Design a protein around this nucleic acid. Structure first.
Length: 45
DNA sequence: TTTTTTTTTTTTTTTTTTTTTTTTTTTTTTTTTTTTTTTTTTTTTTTTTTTTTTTTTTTTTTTTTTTTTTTTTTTTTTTTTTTTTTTTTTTTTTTTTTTTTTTTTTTTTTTTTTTTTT
């Protein structure tokens, strides 16, 4: 691995935004259908 | 060993621009002054029977000047076009909801030092 390794802006943007979007969708905002709680409520309880 | 070329930051102080303190004009805001509404009671006004002498409408006839009337030529009415205003689709922007990422301030208390004023 070199000190500097070029990366396309499209791939970096796609990877970063998809990681953030999937993380939010799966574990910040929507509730689970079974227990009806977000991860915040589950962890607090 | 002496002597010669070049390079920049300072003696800089002045020109240009920027920043920061100012105060005229149309849009708010508190006051006094004039329009509204509900009670008391109060002499006062006003609703309803009886009698009465009145003065205007309906028998009948008359005319004349407003109702008949026809026609010329105007002139208001209608047509087209275009501009001005009103009104409603369209678009844009902003706010709130709930989990996330980030920050930012005001005062007590004592003791010692800078930092201005007299």
């Amino acid at each position: 691995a070199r000190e500097i390794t070029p990366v396309n802006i499209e791939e970096e943007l796609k990877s970063s935004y998809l990681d953030y979007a999937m993380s939010v969708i799966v574990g910040r905002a929507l509730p689970d259908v079974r227990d009806g709680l977000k991860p915040v409520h589950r962890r607090v309880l």
